[PDB]
Design a protein around this ligand. Structure first.
Ligand SMILES: CN(C)Cc1nc2c(sc3ccc(/C=C/C4CC4)cc32)c(=O)[nH]1
Length: 274
């Protein structure tokens, strides 16, 4: 045990959630990320199959970790007197979708579609595992620039998935649905689809559609860049004001604009200059 097996590199980011450092498992040189979370800043606790009292993030991480590389896997975790320390995988080289959009602006449709699909495949995986992320957005998506594979990260506002209503949200406002904004209630799926509508608008317009509460409640989408009619259709569908007017994952993934997606490898070859 102990803090022997890992070697702490540079800090990767921080905030009110905590601090993440680059790290190398000594045990065999694998890249990892070392995420330190303060007990005081966890509002949502959970408990394991094993039955111990851990942050919800750790519960959800365990339920989603396994073969499929569309979600970042949690390799191990530790407890400390005032924090939990999480060890997760780290692709090399890697960059987050937010930075990648800051650099390259609006993405070519073909690139967006391959990115969007992959997010769709990640979120479907979480939904199967009984996990709801609740904070899907460019900053919670890592690109592995060599293999062209997106990895969803940061379950710190997630919850167990359920069919009843959610009356709490501790995620990103500008990505939250209008039913949350007015009534303080949403349902998982439909609120996830809204965040995906936002995410796709982001990808294709270089930036997010709404900044203020009223623009959210109004739900009218102005396009600032050339975007095909079919992409515009899908975005507006995901951003239906009534939750039940929103598409299901299956309906999103059968949308005409979602056809003939590139593979992750082809994607890096053509767009990440692999
Ligand atoms: C997404 N934020 C709030 C923090 C956060 N970062 C990571 C995780 S796993 C993880 C794994 C790798 C890397 C490497 C990133 C490069 C772009 C700087 C970061 C993270 C998380 O769970 N939370």
């Amino acid at each position: 045990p102990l803090e022997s097996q890992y070697q702490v590199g540079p800090l990767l980011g921080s905030g009110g959630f905590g601090s993440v450092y680059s790290g190398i498992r000594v045990s065999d040189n694998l890249p990892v990320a070392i995420k330190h979370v303060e007990k005081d800043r966890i509002s949502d606790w959970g408990e394991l199959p094993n039955g111990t009292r851990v942050p919800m993030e750790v519960v959800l991480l365990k339920k989603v970790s396994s073969g499929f590389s569309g979600v970042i896997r949690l390799l191990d975790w530790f407890e400390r007197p005032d924090s939990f320390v999480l060890i997760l995988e780290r692709p090399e080289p890697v960059q987050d979708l937010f930075d990648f959009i800051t650099e390259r602006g609006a993405l070519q449709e073909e690139l967006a579609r391959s990115f969007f699909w992959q997010v769709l495949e990640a979120v479907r995986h979480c939904h199967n595992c009984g996990v709801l992320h609740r904070d899907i957005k460019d900053e919670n998506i890592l690109i592995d620039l060599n293999r062209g594979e997106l990895k969803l990260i940061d379950f710190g506002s997630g919850a167990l998935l359920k069919d009843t209503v959610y009356t709490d949200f501790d995620g990103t406002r500008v990505y939250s649905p209008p039913e949350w904004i007015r009534y303080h209630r949403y349902h998982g799926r439909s609120a996830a689809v809204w965040s995906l509508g936002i995410l796709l608008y982001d990808m294709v317009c270089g930036d997010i559609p709404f900044e203020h509460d009223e623009e959210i409640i109004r739900g009218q989408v102005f396009f600032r860049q050339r975007v095909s009619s079919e992409c515009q259709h899908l975005i507006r569908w995901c951003l239906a004001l009534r939750p039940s007017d929103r598409p299901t994952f299956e309906e999103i993934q059968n949308h005409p604009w979602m056809q003939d997606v590139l593979l992750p490898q082809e994607t890096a070859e053509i767009h990440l200059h692999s």
